[PDB]
Design an enzyme around this catalytic site. Structure first.
Site, PDB file in Angstrom:
ATOM      1  CD  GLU A 150       6.839 -27.012 -23.297  1.00 19.36           C
ATOM      2  OE1 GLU A 150       6.706 -27.034 -22.054  1.00 19.36           O
ATOM      3  OE2 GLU A 150       7.984 -27.122 -23.883  1.00 19.36           O
ATOM      4  CG  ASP A 202       0.835 -27.121 -19.557  1.00 19.43           C
ATOM      5  OD1 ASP A 202      -0.001 -27.434 -18.762  1.00 19.43           O
ATOM      6  OD2 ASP A 202       2.028 -27.209 -19.312  1.00 19.43           O
ATOM      7  CG  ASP A 243       8.428  -6.865 -25.425  1.00 17.76           C
ATOM      8  OD1 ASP A 243       9.614  -6.912 -25.801  1.00 17.76           O
ATOM      9  OD2 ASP A 243       7.577  -6.083 -25.937  1.00 17.76           O
ATOM     10  CE1 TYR A 244      10.009 -10.589 -16.037  1.00 13.74           C
ATOM     11  CE2 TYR A 244       8.678  -8.628 -15.606  1.00 13.74           C
ATOM     12  CZ  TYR A 244       9.312  -9.777 -15.161  1.00 13.74           C
ATOM     13  OH  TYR A 244       9.285 -10.159 -13.862  1.00 13.74           O
ATOM     14  CB  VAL A 245       3.931  -9.796 -19.418  1.00 11.01           C
ATOM     15  CG1 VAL A 245       2.599  -9.210 -18.930  1.00 11.01           C
ATOM     16  CG2 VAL A 245       4.033  -9.711 -20.916  1.00 11.01           C
ATOM     17  NE  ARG A 290       8.544 -21.419 -24.225  1.00 11.56           N
ATOM     18  CZ  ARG A 290       7.979 -22.298 -23.394  1.00 11.56           C
ATOM     19  NH1 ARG A 290       8.103 -23.582 -23.651  1.00 11.56           N
ATOM     20  NH2 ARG A 290       7.267 -21.890 -22.333  1.00 11.56           N
ATOM     21  CG  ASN A 347       1.611 -23.059 -18.154  1.00  9.22           C
ATOM     22  OD1 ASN A 347       2.691 -22.830 -17.593  1.00  9.22           O
ATOM     23  ND2 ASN A 347       1.278 -24.285 -18.657  1.00  9.22           N
ATOM     24  CG  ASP A 398       4.265 -23.866 -20.778  1.00  7.97           C
ATOM     25  OD1 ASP A 398       4.829 -24.303 -21.803  1.00  7.97           O
ATOM     26  OD2 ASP A 398       4.302 -24.482 -19.662  1.00  7.97           O
TER      27      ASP A 398
HETATM   28  N1  LIG Z   1       6.855 -13.167 -21.284  1.00  5.61           N
HETATM   29  C1  LIG Z   1       7.102 -13.410 -19.962  1.00  5.61           C
HETATM   30  N2  LIG Z   1       7.149 -12.373 -19.094  1.00  5.61           N
HETATM   31  C2  LIG Z   1       7.427 -12.476 -17.773  1.00  5.61           C
HETATM   32  N3  LIG Z   1       7.705 -13.673 -17.215  1.00  5.61           N
HETATM   33  C3  LIG Z   1       7.680 -14.818 -17.955  1.00  5.61           C
HETATM   34  C4  LIG Z   1       7.376 -14.751 -19.404  1.00  5.61           C
HETATM   35  N4  LIG Z   1       7.437 -16.032 -19.857  1.00  5.61           N
HETATM   36  C5  LIG Z   1       7.756 -16.832 -18.804  1.00  5.61           C
HETATM   37  N5  LIG Z   1       7.899 -16.107 -17.676  1.00  5.61           N
HETATM   38  C6  LIG Z   1       8.243 -16.635 -16.313  1.00  5.61           C
HETATM   39  O1  LIG Z   1       8.699 -17.965 -16.452  1.00  5.61           O
HETATM   40  C7  LIG Z   1       7.796 -18.932 -15.882  1.00  5.61           C
HETATM   41  C8  LIG Z   1       7.853 -20.070 -16.893  1.00  5.61           C
HETATM   42  O2  LIG Z   1       7.071 -19.758 -18.045  1.00  5.61           O
HETATM   43  P1  LIG Z   1       6.457 -20.986 -18.868  1.00  5.61           P
HETATM   44  O3  LIG Z   1       5.404 -21.620 -17.966  1.00  5.61           O
HETATM   45  O4  LIG Z   1       6.102 -20.438 -20.251  1.00  5.61           O
HETATM   46  O5  LIG Z   1       7.809 -21.819 -18.965  1.00  5.61           O
HETATM   47  P2  LIG Z   1       8.078 -23.389 -18.951  1.00  5.61           P
HETATM   48  O6  LIG Z   1       9.493 -23.701 -19.271  1.00  5.61           O
HETATM   49  O7  LIG Z   1       7.388 -23.949 -20.172  1.00  5.61           O
HETATM   50  O8  LIG Z   1       7.011 -24.158 -18.097  1.00  5.61           O
HETATM   51  P3  LIG Z   1       7.017 -24.733 -16.580  1.00  5.61           P
HETATM   52  O9  LIG Z   1       6.773 -23.624 -15.563  1.00  5.61           O
HETATM   53  O10 LIG Z   1       5.765 -25.627 -16.891  1.00  5.61           O
HETATM   54  O11 LIG Z   1       8.376 -25.434 -16.495  1.00  5.61           O
HETATM   55  C9  LIG Z   1       6.484 -18.190 -15.834  1.00  5.61           C
HETATM   56  O12 LIG Z   1       5.665 -18.607 -14.761  1.00  5.61           O
HETATM   57  C10 LIG Z   1       6.927 -16.738 -15.589  1.00  5.61           C
HETATM   58  O13 LIG Z   1       7.241 -16.486 -14.223  1.00  5.61           O
HETATM   59 MG   LIG Z   2       4.784 -23.712 -17.590  1.00  7.25          MG
HETATM   60 MG   LIG Z   3       6.092 -25.894 -20.450  1.00  3.95          MG
END
Ligand SMILES: Nc1ncnc2c1ncn2[C@@H]1O[C@H](COP(=O)(O)OP(=O)(O)OP(=O)(O)O)[C@@H](O)[C@H]1O
Ligand SMILES: [Mg+2]
Ligand SMILES: [Mg+2]
Ligand SMILES: [Ca+2]
Ligand SMILES: [Ca+2]
EC number: 2.7.1.-
Length: 352
Positions: free
Chosen positions: A243, A223, A113-115, A58, A228, A241
């Site tokens: 933030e 959020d 980590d990736y989930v 991030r 999310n 997410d």
């Molecule tokens: N730790 C994680 N493991 C696996 N996939 C993730 C992880 N974090 C984020 N992702 C992938 O990225 C997408 C975005 O995550 P997140 O919603 O935290 O990001 P974003 O930049 O804040 O928000 P938005 O989707 O609202 O733009 C998630 O839906 C998921 O597919």
């Molecule tokens: Mg999001």
């Molecule tokens: Mg976001």
């Protein structure tokens, strides 16, 4: 360069001779817009065999990017996710590294980590059908809903929330409210003013939810919505997410979750689709939440109106970025971007 950096950090924590190689799996969303959340693949050698790990970065946006928010505290997001993992069984990703200086990449970032799992989609909104959540059996959708409310209830149940999460900060609502006004002002600088939001802020001031704001604040996810959360088999496997994480009244998170789905119901209506009217009903969500926490929730009405201002703010920022990048033409009335203006006009016409 993001990969070079992660490769380097990898070289510092793995055995010498690991020789890690990092590449980007996914640095943009499904519309080709560069993403703040970046999926990376790390490959290395250990005892003559290949190890392969997915990592999620991030990264804090630069000005040139048209950031949604006036300021960023990824360090706060880091510590909250870590604390949530330590103190609850709410599923979150394990955090790995925070670089708070911005000296390495240009801007702060953290690594997770990736989930693995699936998310009810934002594009197209899951209420448009043709996705794994919209197409599931009623029962399974409702099982997901209740598990998500339960995750919320669990986060709201963490003891001494203002002590534990003090780095996050009259009351917590007052302060949150001044932040929302700052965000609006920030968005104005990029797209122009909204007479509707301005009247809404006057409305929110003059109809303050005193009781809700005088109760004990909880940790707020922010959020707080199904889009999310990563899911495996209709159960949460990672809450994402953070933030908009804050301390504040519990109503904010619960209202946000319900209202969020309302916005997508409205979008589905405008695409003339039926959406998902039985999902995330206020009555169902209040009852589950209340059954789980034994805590009575305040009237959510003010917190719907407030979520509507926050959503409008996101849309103003989405708008600024789309015109900056030529992708759409500035609308002449910014309120044209607010799918939910109608919803809000009707809420404002109510008396609670
Ligand atoms: N730790 C994680 N493991 C696996 N996939 C993730 C992880 N974090 C984020 N992702 C992938 O990225 C997408 C975005 O995550 P997140 O919603 O935290 O990001 P974003 O930049 O804040 O928000 P938005 O989707 O609202 O733009 C998630 O839906 C998921 O597919
Ligand atoms: Mg999001
Ligand atoms: Mg976001
Ligand atoms: Ca845990
Ligand atoms: Ca009325």
């Amino acid at each position: 360069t993001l990969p070079a950096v992660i490769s380097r950090w990898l070289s510092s924590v793995l055995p010498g001779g690991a020789a890690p190689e990092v590449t980007v799996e996914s640095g943009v969303d499904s519309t080709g817009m560069s993403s703040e959340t970046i999926i990376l693949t790390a490959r290395w050698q250990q005892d003559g065999r290949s190890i392969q790990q997915k990592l999620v970065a991030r990264v804090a946006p630069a000005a040139e990017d048209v950031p949604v928010f006036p300021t960023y505290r990824l360090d706060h997001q880091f510590e909250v996710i870590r604390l949530v993992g330590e103190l609850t069984d709410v599923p979150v990703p394990r955090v790995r590294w925070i670089e708070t200086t911005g000296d390495v990449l240009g801007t702060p970032f953290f690594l997770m980590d990736y989930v693995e799992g699936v998310v009810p989609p934002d594009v197209m909104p899951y209420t448009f059908g043709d996705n794994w959540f919209a197409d599931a059996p009623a029962e399974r959708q409702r099982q997901l809903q209740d598990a998500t409310v339960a995750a919320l209830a669990t986060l709201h149940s963490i003891p001494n929330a203002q002590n534990t999460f003090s780095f996050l900060t009259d009351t917590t609502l007052h302060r949150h409210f001044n932040w929302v006004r700052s965000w609006y002002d920030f968005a104005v600088e990029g797209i122009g003013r909204s007479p509707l939001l301005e009247r809404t802020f006057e409305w929110l001031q003059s109809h303050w939810p005193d009781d809700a704001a005088a109760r004990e604040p909880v940790l707020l996810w922010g959020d707080a919505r199904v889009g999310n959360v990563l899911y495996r088999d209709f159960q949460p496997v990672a809450v994402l997410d953070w933030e908009m994480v804050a301390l504040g009244p519990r109503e904010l998170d619960v209202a946000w979750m319900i209202f969020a789905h309302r916005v997508f119901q409205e979008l589905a209506g405008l695409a003339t689709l039926p959406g998902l009217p039985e999902v995330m009903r206020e009555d169902d969500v209040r009852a589950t939440y209340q059954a789980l926490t034994g805590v009575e929730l305040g009237d959510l009405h003010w917190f719907y109106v407030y979520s509507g201002v926050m959503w409008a703010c996101v849309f103003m920022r989405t708008g600024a970025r789309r015109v900056h990048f030529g992708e759409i033409e500035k609308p002449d009335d910014v309120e044209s971007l607010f799918y939910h203006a109608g919803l809000m006009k009707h809420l404002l016409g109510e008396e609670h």
